[PDB]
Symmetry: D3
């Protein structure tokens, strides 16, 4: 391996310059299988990586695990291997009453409720997605006619207190996050997830292109959801090769 | 008879306008409005000069913000009270990237928040991000006139001098926070400095208003008219797509 | 034409002046200048209108700053380049104390730094404090004409609306930082709100420049003024030449 | 399932109140194998879990994945299922010159270079280990005579820039972390890893007991990446049942 | 006269002492020293009163810190200059858990840093953590002496009043940061408030000095607004 | 005692509304000796208090101990007892080359390098002195005849790393304070001391008047250090000034 965690070499990529990066290792093969010539590359820790082909060009599918820290490892090591464009495809809880389960959300930028993004840029720097990538995702969502919402996502280092969940062991939420969901709602934030702030900040501050699309699995106020978002990211990738 | 404290405008003055182009300098307001139909002066108070015009049958506002986030936040809030829901910032700017030359145009996707006013709308974690539709329209408009365009991040500073790490000053000093900062933004891909976008983009993105920003490059510290006109044609053409 | 980037002034225009009175509104510049000897227009560019006059045979500058720290920081810097060493801000203001009434005059000893520009000169730990000689001159000028004067702390905000906890706005919301903030400043004895002094005082106190500030109360949140605050700033200038 | 991520029910725990939590899903089976009656429970995402028995009491082994965010999910859901004591067994990079690869490091408390700890307690709160757990770990290390060091650990949300690694795609480290390793070294910090700040903070602030131990796999005074602790964590567990 | 600026002590005065017991109150120094052999008064300047004594044949220093991190930081630094490498604070404290009784003994594993001086040694992310051997000696000493003992986190405040969310004050105002804070620390399991441990533990842990912290409960805040001394002496014996 | 630490009652004050607050308990008697009929009231921990009479009015002298935390206790408890005006008198090391030993420093406001101030007001709030107190101190300095500097003071929770001293056990200074003395120098900060940030902030944010004056007994930039009596003649000067200022504030 050329890299410490992923267990991949530059040759494994066969010239790939774009990676699709879901959180769940189990989702990796499902995405690769939608493209031509899917081949498993490696599986270490939460990092499962496959290669496939899109319109004749090699593409990587590599899981990030949950959270900015493992995401930052996958992105860095893929970048070392030659990836310059990253498309995250994830799941998300919506926090706006008008956003229905199964909807598709394209993230323009993220509220940085993580710690890893700070390891790349100070908080003043925007966790902003690449324009080409965001455009490709939006245009891909339109081509398949999905109900799409485009805007800001809150990206949290926790699933529970940072998304102001009280249904927990302690039932306590620290002061910083008490009342935070309503605040994000009033500010027009669409949804919560846990990787985009790190992904977008680390890419935008290092000359890498990143986009973020997600399928709505719950509304904080199903099957064809993932499929739709997954279709969208693969189609978007075609436009970015 | 004004409905707002600073702008000296009433809702009626807007004639149903829902979009405003917002340059910094009052002296540029008529010139922009003059590119559109039936331009008329509305008012002039402090750094807030407003004109109404018409674009493909729809009323549009052109209103200056003055220099800096504080004045901008006043113009934007009061225009919002008056019914504006879409704001397009037009400016001329320097650049901090060597590959960016005078004559190029910059469309800002999001800004580094080196201001104070943005914090009065959203905590620092919140992204000073432009509206997708506005950014799209600005890029496509730049495309239609064949402008050499750069799309990316802009550093938005409450100062012209130390926050842009200028040392040619009275004190010749730059506070620790900003010492070495220009090189840091350069390494992070930041295109340029200006002084209003962090405030504009943050206050709009966190209050359901659409904002975008375009600027012509007139200078570059690492290394004019046409550039300006281009930027202005771009912002007017973009406004047409957003009505 | 100009020794500075924005003001459109040369050192020659100042005729040796070392003190500037700095109102916010360009419209007020001529009025202040008119109270002194030999008043003449200098220049007008953006929100920076400048006049020169004379007191006791010494040149004095009057120059507007525009609204807010950013434009203030430009005016003060460029005036400092041209030789100004003492700055007296004159404003009108809204009081936050029940017993500070319209028509009262406020002299600011130091400001609560609710701005961004002050941080471009000194870290937050540094006091946005007025120069003692300036504050003395203003207080003594105020007493010499019998104004009802309050001396103390001013809250200096980058916004007119949320930073001063105004809810009569488009969104009707105030970010967490500022919710409940007016009552807090009130309990801490803060006199009033305005928008330029944190920047002015900090940038002067941290770079060997003298600054003071006086303001007329023309309204009170908890419920001819110009002429008096203006008379005070000119009489104070007389004492500082 | 009783919880959203782990795919476990309280019944799967068989009354277990202690969990050993490695970062790598592949280490779980190996840890479980050192105990009696090892049984696989589930594997979802980076969360692989096994049950075993120690001195006739059920014990859980469950991986956390890399980083605070996924750790916070595993700990929370284990807590919901009934776990009250958590022993992290990790790998680590030493930052002191005389720590040998293979050495066992027991963490008393962590430098919070993560984001997730802040979702449980403000930064002022110490990421401190439980005294009984730390004691059990030290005493267990003593009983097998491993080379052991006890002290403070820097816990980072990144593998690369937050641990001041420069052999990366960008080769740059953000201002906050430039010169940081030398600083921690001067302060006597022993090592870097990526989970303890979150684990220790979230446990200490919610009435859960946590201990932290790791084997050194690289010495950072010499290189950024490499070309006993497990026995100790199991023995320590015995003492805490 | 004195090898350090504030304490008025010389390296000679310590007679090779490498451990110091550091109470807050100068008036308690003589009392503690008296529990050991050959107690001799050394110096008394400002809030810094110091005695030397002997414990199982070895020199030991007792030196007051005064109230608060700043004065503590001076005493610890200057004692370190004179050769002290182990510091055991013995204090008084208000419990904030209902289950902790007055007269109970609290051993601190780490402190909530509600002080400013700790930041002069390490950034906020660094833990104000006690030395493991010192903490162990205190817990073991507490068994030996016999006392109801709790081991855990302590909130260390730069103020006695607003930082411990006391309202019995001139202004009756508690700043936003501290409004509701006691109940927050309570829910997070914090045992008690005092005013020196965050500075002490942070400055020691970040400078290769060993520090431990024990205190006797003199009030319980959920109700209103000699074991510890024997314990700190016994712990010192275990650390020489 | 009406208060938890000071061992004082309202009766002890005899209607006093002004307190002079040196840091060192040993200085309290010395300052009181500059006034009429001084009597010792109490001594507990670092808090030694005396009452004296100034132009026929009761005045308290009470030590604060070193640092914002003990200072906050003294000021708060004195406020409870009825004190409304506080004058700190210190001795200090200057950091400007032009500020000479023997000079007197009057502080208009302080750089908040302390923790206790934050327990009264967020960092944005200025650690600013009361105008009447500052005026009285400046005027008294002129009555006494001192060479006076008026301006900003850096108020640190430590004597060592926070004042960027490297002559210490570890010989290291945390990142925050590395290079900080040169920064404060460039910003015109006059000196370091350790109580004013807390004092000035807690008073300005609670309707209390506070001023600060100090005698310069050493300069961080100069090689030579005044003899056995670095303070004494200078100390005496600042003390005479704080008493003379108190006269104007009664
Ligand atoms: O509310 C949610 C729902 C889903 N997700 C999100 N928050 O975090 C993302 C994690 O990777 C993982 C955590 O369940 O899935 C994404
Ligand atoms: O330098 C290192 C070496 C090992 N580890 C550490 N940093 O982070 C821990 C991660 O879980 C994972 C990162 O590889 O293993 C632990
Ligand atoms: O609530 C309390 C009670 C006692 N103490 C504490 N807080 O601070 C410690 C101080 O040294 C001093 C404060 O009175 O005593 C310790
Ligand atoms: K993970
Ligand atoms: K302006
Ligand atoms: K003290």
């Amino acid at each position: 391996s050329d890299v410490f965690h992923l267990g991949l070499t530059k040759n494994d990529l066969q010239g790939a310059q774009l990676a699709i990066v879901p959180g769940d290792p189990e989702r990796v093969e499902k995405i690769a299988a939608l493209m031509d010539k899917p081949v498993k590359l490696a599986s270490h820790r939460e990092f499962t990586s496959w290669r496939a082909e899109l319109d004749g060009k090699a593409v990587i599918v590599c899981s990030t695990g949950i959270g900015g820290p493992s995401t930052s490892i996958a992105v860095e090591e893929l970048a070392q291997l030659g990836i310059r464009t990253f498309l995250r495809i994830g799941t998300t809880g919506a926090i706006q009453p008008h956003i229905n389960v199964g909807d598709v959300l394209v993230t323009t930028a993220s509220v940085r409720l993580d710690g890893a993004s700070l390891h790349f840029a100070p908080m003043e720097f925007p966790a902003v997605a690449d324009f080409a990538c965001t455009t490709a995702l939006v245009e891909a969502a339109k081509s398949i006619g999905a109900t799409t919402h485009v805007g800001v996502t809150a990206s949290s280092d926790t699933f529970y207190p940072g998304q102001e969940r009280y249904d927990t062991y302690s039932g306590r939420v620290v002061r910083r996050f008490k009342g935070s969901m309503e605040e994000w709602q009033a500010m027009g934030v669409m949804n919560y997830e846990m990787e985009s702030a790190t992904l977008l900040t680390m890419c935008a501050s290092q000359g890498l292109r990143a986009g973020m699309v997600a399928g709505v699995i719950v509304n904080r106020t199903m099957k064809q959801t993932e499929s739709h978002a997954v279709k969208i990211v693969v189609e978007a990738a075609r436009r970015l090769l």
